[PDB]
Swiss-Prot record, chain B:
Native organism: Human immunodeficiency virus type 1 group M subtype B (isolate BH10)
Site description Essential for RT p66/p51 heterodimerization, residues in chain: 403, 416
Organism taxonomic ancestry: Viruses, Riboviria, Pararnavirae, Artverviricota, Revtraviricetes
Variant or mutagenesis effect after changing residue 439 to I: Replication slightly delayed
Domain Reverse transcriptase: 46-236
Protein name: Reverse transcriptase/ribonuclease H
Length: 415, 556
């Protein structure tokens, strides 16, 4: 109820980010939401002496009918002081990724109970545009901790720890981790048990609150069942010239990740200038080399470590037929996680919706495993992504991304 | 007296660390000084400025300009220095409405609010920074010192604060009268509606009564401006719109600057005149910016100019937006990277038109360009109408399906239907997913020496067919492409090709149908003639048969 002092980083002005174009349905929804928020004292109209801006849009969280306001604070988040007064966003819990069930709660509504430092409010300015700019955009700033701002969980942390003290000492094996507007709650219980403990948790925030529009929701994860992608080589009885060339190509690539991979004996099978479809019998020497390579590929990659000071990088490849592969790393050839998807939701004829869902799922995995979001290298033209991703977005955070314009030859090797 | 509501002041600051201006007042002639004193005495009587003591240390220069063909002098306070020191403001005029998003109106009335402008007070704590000095006659007494109490003309914050103040005043009227639209441009309010003239004029009277609550008077003798409005380069009429007249000059010889003005006119025209083209005329501006240099018009630029004159022969108008009807966007390929489009709701009545040009790049293809044009029109349509139009595109549904399912990137175009209007966008070649049984296998390679620029390109095949060609003035990259070209030239209609060139694979996997490289263009032409092509990559220098033999032949 008393404001925590907040500053930007030294020699750093507030965000001045352009509002991107919004559809009629999203403008109508934001007008309605913001009219309510203004009545409830959460935001106030501002004047022209405030030149700052952060983009806003609206989303429908997974399995809902109601619009949620989403402010894109990525720039304000970069420019905001780091929060190390005492608690450092909690050392990441390494056991959250080992629980049988992790439920994700939207708890962002709790932040609106804490006022925002009067001198920092101007930097939260945003604009509801009008269609065709026919009427002046509606300008607001926040009076309370906003959803999506890095400072909100930091400032609210003290109050959140106190809300869940009763639930924590009652359920000491439960891992509870907060990231931005999400609360991640991991248990090893049976799911019907789990959902009841989750509902138990909701009541603590319902009772403290006295209504949160999306607190009732639950995104259920099962990180103990998360699958990885080791390198595997074909097992064949008939190898064509083409098959062996593909094998030597994949092994050459793997030898950058794994030291002792050899291709000398396999290449020797191709001596001459043969038709691509001709079948070549494996010699014993080439078969030995191949088995030795298979054995190397069963071991972990050497010298792989996570450094919390370095960015995580996520790469994604489109494999076709709705399948997507991805790798998360900090240094080239030192993958920290690899994976593959196919069950991409109601998007069998929409590549870009599938990629947007993939991006969300990888970011969620990143949050659960390291407590931060990765920087994506997306296989899509910037203009196509920027026109469409907000139509499919269902998360309350937004990662960073860049665009891949040249086809990677390595897509073949992750297939 | 009738009490009036005050207009709330906007708090204003100088930029961090900066102080107000302290600019020397220029010397003035005795005649200019007497004119300024008269002018400022009137302004002071009106409350716009106030005399200040000598403690204020700030100053901005003031000038006297002869209003041409009149014995009347006009005052100019030059606020350039204070503007550099004044904070940035939120600017609303950044986005201007496009006429094609407006709605038809039966009546549009104009109201002058020039007098309202200076009922807008300046933040009391900022006034000191607006100080200026009229010099005295013969400089024998202190100059007269004044500061502003209202928003000064030419000060950085005046447009934003005036707009914000009027918007706040108009907000309740607009909300409680949803059957009118109101727009502020300069010192005028435009009020439009679909009411019968009686009710419409009643709304105007009520607006004047609303404005009086703040003491803002509007002239009784109604405005001289009446439809059509000349606004931001457009002509707005009650039920249609167009661009102001576009007249391409006749010229025997053309300058850099003349071509820049011609392209600007054409670009402006292209939003309602269908089919305008500017590629060949913009090609003449490549690189150079010597505004007076003359450039010969190529025959292709003259053809383009001629075509544009024909398009601009007679007026064309757009219609306004009917929110009850779908928006449709149709696109045509024009050639040389150019695309043109029309957005309409009823057949043959365009809301607007426009064009798209191929981005600068080494390689491209029509499907990619069509896709970019669709995204551009989509985003423009969200701005203007708040929704995506349904598209009519010159590409078969089966062509698109093949393209996007096989393309290495994610790609999407929103709801659309095929329109069978040539030229159609098609896939000129598709590579095989698997090696071709019975097709000859060419192992290609090239190499070059970086010092001599001499190289070799060639192939060897499983049938013993072989070729090596010596090359001059070349590079490793060029020789690798040359080798693939030779294999395409010398093979039958089905061919397997094995290369170690990651560079060539990167190009071919991008599926270009046109390139800045004439060698890539030659490869594309050969690919179009084949029935089946499978392109296989192997790593270099790994003892792979075929590849090893040809690498030795070409690196010799
Ligand atoms: C942007 C705008 C500029 C002008 C005027 C600017 C100036 N000068 C006048 C008005 C009233 C508006 N605002 C809107 C809003 C929605 N529909 C319309 N339709 C509309 C406007 C003018 C005419 C006419 N004639 C017809 C329809 N105008
Ligand atoms: N003009 C105008 C206007 C409007 N149409 C709506 C709201 C506030 C405003 F200032
Ligand atoms: Mg070589």
């Amino acid at each position: 109820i008393e404001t925590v002092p907040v500053k930007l980083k030294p020699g750093m002005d507030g965000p001045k980010v352009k509002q991107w174009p919004l559809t009629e349905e999203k403008i109508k929804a934001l007008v309605e939401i913001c009219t309510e928020m203004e009545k409830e004292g959460k935001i106030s109209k501002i004047g022209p002496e405030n030149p700052y801006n952060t983009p806003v849009f609206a989303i429908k969280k997974k399995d809902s009918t109601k619009w949620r306001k989403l402010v894109d604070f990525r720039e304000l988040n970069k420019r905001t002081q780091d929060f190390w007064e005492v608690q450092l966003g909690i050392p990441h819990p390494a056991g959250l990724k080992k629980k049988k069930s992790v439920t994700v709660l939207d708890v962002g509504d709790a932040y609106f109970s804490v006022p925002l430092d009067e001198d920092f409010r101007k930097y939260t300015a945003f604009t509801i545009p009008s269609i065709n700019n026919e009427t002046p955009g509606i300008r607001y700033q926040y009076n309370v901790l906003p959803q999506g701002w890095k400072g909100s969980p930091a400032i609210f942390q003290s109050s959140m720890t106190k809300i869940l003290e009763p639930f924590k000492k009652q359920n000491p094996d439960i891992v509870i981790y907060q990231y931005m507007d999400d609360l991640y709650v991991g248990s090893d219980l049976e799911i019907g048990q789990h959902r009841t403990k989750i509902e138990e948790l909701r009541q603590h925030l319902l009772r403290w609150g006295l209504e949160p529009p999306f607190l009732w929701m639950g995104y259920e994860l099962h990180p103990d069942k998360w699958t990885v992608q080791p390198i595997v080589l074909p097992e064949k009885d008939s190898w064509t010239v083409n098959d062996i060339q593909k094998l030597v190509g994949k092994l050459n690539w793997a030898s950058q990740i794994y030291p002792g991979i050899k291709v000398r004996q396999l290449s020797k099978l191709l001596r001459g200038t043969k038709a691509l479809t001709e079948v070549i019998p494996l010699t014993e020497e080439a078969e030995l080399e191949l088995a030795e390579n298979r054995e190397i590929l069963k071991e972990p990659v050497h010298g792989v470590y996570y450094d919390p000071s370095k960015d995580l990088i996520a790469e994604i490849q489109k494999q076709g037929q709705g399948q997507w592969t991805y790798q998360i790393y900090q240094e080239p050839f030192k993958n920290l996680k690899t994976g593959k998807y196919a069950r991409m939701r109601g998007a069998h004829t929409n590549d870009v919706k599938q990629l947007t869902e993939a991006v969300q799922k990888i970011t969620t995995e990143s949050i659960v495993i390291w407590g931060k979001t990765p920087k994506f290298k997306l296989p899509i033209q910037k203009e196509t992504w920027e026109t469409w991703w907000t139509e499919y977005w269902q998360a309350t955070w937004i990662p960073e991304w860049e665009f891949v314009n040249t086809p990677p030859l390595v897509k073949l090797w992750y297939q | 007296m009738v009490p009036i509501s005050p207009i709330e002041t906007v708090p204003v600051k100088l930029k961090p660390g900066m102080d107000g201006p302290k600019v020397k007042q220029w010397p003035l002639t005795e005649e200019k000084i007497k004119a300024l004193v008269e002018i400022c005495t009137e302004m002071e009587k009106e409350g716009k400025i106030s005399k200040i003591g000598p403690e204020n240390p700030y100053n901005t220069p003031v000038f006297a300009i002869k209003k041409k063909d009149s014995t009347k002098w006009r005052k100019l306070v030059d606020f350039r220095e204070l503007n550099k020191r004044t904070q940035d403001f939120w600017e609303v005029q950044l986005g201007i409405p496009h006429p094609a998003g407006l709605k038809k109106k039966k009546s549009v009335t104009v109201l002058d609010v020039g007098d309202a402008y200076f009922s807008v007070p300046l933040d009391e704590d900022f006034r000191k920074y607006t100080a200026f000095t009229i010099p005295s006659i013969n400089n024998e007494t202190p100059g007269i010192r004044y500061q502003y109490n209202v928003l000064p003309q030419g000060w950085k914050g005046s447009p934003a604060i005036f707009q914000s103040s009027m918007t706040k005043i108009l907000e309740p009227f607009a909300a409680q009268n949803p059957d009118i639209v109101i727009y502020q441009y300069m010192d005028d309010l435009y009020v439009g509606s679909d009411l019968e003239i009686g009710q419409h004029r009643t709304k105007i009277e009520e607006l004047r009564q609303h404005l009086l609550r703040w003491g803002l008077t509007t002239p009784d003798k109604k405005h001289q401006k009446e439809p059509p409005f000349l606004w931001m380069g457009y002509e707005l009429h009650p039920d249609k719109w167009t661009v102001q007249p576009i007249v391409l000059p006749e010229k025997d010889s053309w300058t850099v600057n003349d071509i820049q003005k011609l392209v600007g006119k054409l670009n402006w025209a292209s939003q309602i005149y269908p089919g305008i083209k500017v590629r060949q005329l913009s090609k003449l501006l490549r690189g150079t910016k010597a505004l007076t240099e003359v450039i010969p018009l190529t025959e292709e630029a003259e053809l383009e100019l001629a075509e544009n004159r024909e398009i601009l022969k007679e007026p064309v108008h757009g219609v306004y937006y009917d929110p009850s009807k779908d928006l449709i966007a149709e696109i045509q390929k024009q050639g040389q990277g150019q695309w043109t489009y029309q957005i309409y709701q009823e057949p043959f009545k365009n809301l607007k038109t426009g064009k798209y040009a191929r981005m600068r790049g080494a390689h491209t293809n029509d499907v990619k360009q069509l896709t970019e044009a669709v995204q551009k029109i989509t985003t423009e349509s969200i701005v203007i109408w708040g929704k995506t139009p349904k598209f009519k595109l010159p590409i078969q549904k089966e062509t698109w399906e093949t393209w996007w399912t096989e393309y290495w990137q994610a790609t999407w175009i929103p709801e659309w239907e095929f329109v069978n209007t040539p030229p159609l966008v098609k896939l000129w070649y598709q590579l095989e997913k698997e090696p071709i049984v019975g097709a000859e296998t060419f192992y290609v390679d090239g190499a070059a020496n970086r010092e001599t620029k001499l190289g070799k390109a060639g192939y060897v095949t499983n049938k013993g067919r072989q070729k090596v060609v010596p090359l001059t003035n070349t590079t490793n990259q060029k020789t690798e492409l040359q080798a693939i070209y030779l294999a395409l030239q010398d093979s039958g209609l089905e061919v397997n090709i094995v290369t170690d060139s990651q560079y060539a694979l990167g190009i071919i996997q991008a599926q270009p149908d046109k390139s800045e490289s004439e060698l890539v263009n030659q490869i594309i032409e050969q690919l179009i003639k084949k029935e089946k092509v499978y392109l296989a990559w192997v790593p270099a220098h790994k003892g792979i048969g075929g590849n090893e033999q040809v690498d030795k032949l070409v690196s010799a």
